[PDB]
Amino acid sequence: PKMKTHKGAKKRVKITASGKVVAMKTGKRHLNWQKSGKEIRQKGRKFVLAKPEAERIKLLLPY
Amino acid sequence: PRAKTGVVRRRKHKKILKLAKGYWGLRSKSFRKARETLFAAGNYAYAHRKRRKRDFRRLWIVRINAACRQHGLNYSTFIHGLKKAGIEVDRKNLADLAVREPQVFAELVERAKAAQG
């Protein structure tokens, strides 16, 4: 029958206009204890490739 | 629709059985045995068509040799005359002159060994 979106993915990565997959930078939910502002800061969003391609394929019905 | 086998098979089968006539034992009564035997027949030919072409070059050379030797020289020297002299002719096949026209052949030899004198 029909297809189910993957909530796991839907909950952590956003898909943009150009069809690009964008998600937070992984490495700071707790690592830290002292990491030079630079590291702990430098955390906006980012991409992937051949990998985001794999994502979009799970967020179909949610386009 | 139900595309039952029916006619189709039985036809391709007796088609190989035909190519396989005259073979020993089952090589001609069994599609399988046939099928195989034929494959061998397939390449044995192919290869021998190319062998045949080399087969007759031998026949000729041996004769060509035997002829211009009982005359005076060998096959090594003989083909060098008809080559230095420039008579890019005979063609080991047409060297049946040694069989038919010895008077014409002997002529070639004489104007061949002479190409060395």
């Binding site: 993957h6 796991g8 993915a9 839907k10 909950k11 952590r12 990565v13 956003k14 998600a23 937070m24 992984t26 939910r29 969003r45 992937v48 990998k51 794999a54 994502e55 394929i57 799970k58 | -």
Partner: protein
């Protein structure tokens, strides 16, 4: 036009791909010739290796919702006066939905770019900068819904 000749165009290619015979896609069946492809592989959209999928990336979308459900809310779908200059006279949602945008998509904003025609535009909210373009002849209907 004769009965027996309306024929499929030049690309209906019913040519499927049977994979059984001597020449063509065949025997081990056009593809595969190893194993673990005999009745199923794992994915790979998101699976295998046996390792961290690629699920090492964390959830930002902070607000996956409590259990009661998503919260009812007025939904605003903005429109471009750019696509608005297709008709003249009275411009109000309803004549807007059955026309182009919205389609019961709740409320209607209004912003866009490009030249704006000097008329009346009945909207629920106007974008600052894209409203100064209506300061060059036009209307300004606001609020509503009750």
């Amino acid at each position: 036009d004769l009965r027996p000749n309306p024929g499929a165009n030049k690309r209906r290619k019913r040519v499927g791909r049977g994979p059984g015979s001597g020449h063509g896609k065949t025997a081990t069946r056009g593809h595969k010739g190893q194993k673990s492809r005999s009745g199923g592989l794992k994915d790979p959209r998101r699976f295998e290796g046996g390792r961290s999928t690629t699920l090492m990336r964390l959830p930002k979308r902070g607000m996956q919702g409590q259990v009661p459900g998503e919260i009812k809310r007025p939904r605003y779908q903005g429109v471009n006066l750019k696509d608005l200059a297709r008709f003249e006279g009275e411009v109000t949602p309803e004549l807007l939905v059955r026309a182009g945008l919205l389609k019961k998509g709740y409320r209607l904003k209004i912003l866009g770019e490009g030249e704006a025609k000097p008329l009346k535009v009945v909207a629920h909210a106007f974008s600052k900068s894209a409203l100064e373009k209506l300061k060059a002849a036009g209307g300004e209907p606001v609020l509503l819904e009750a």
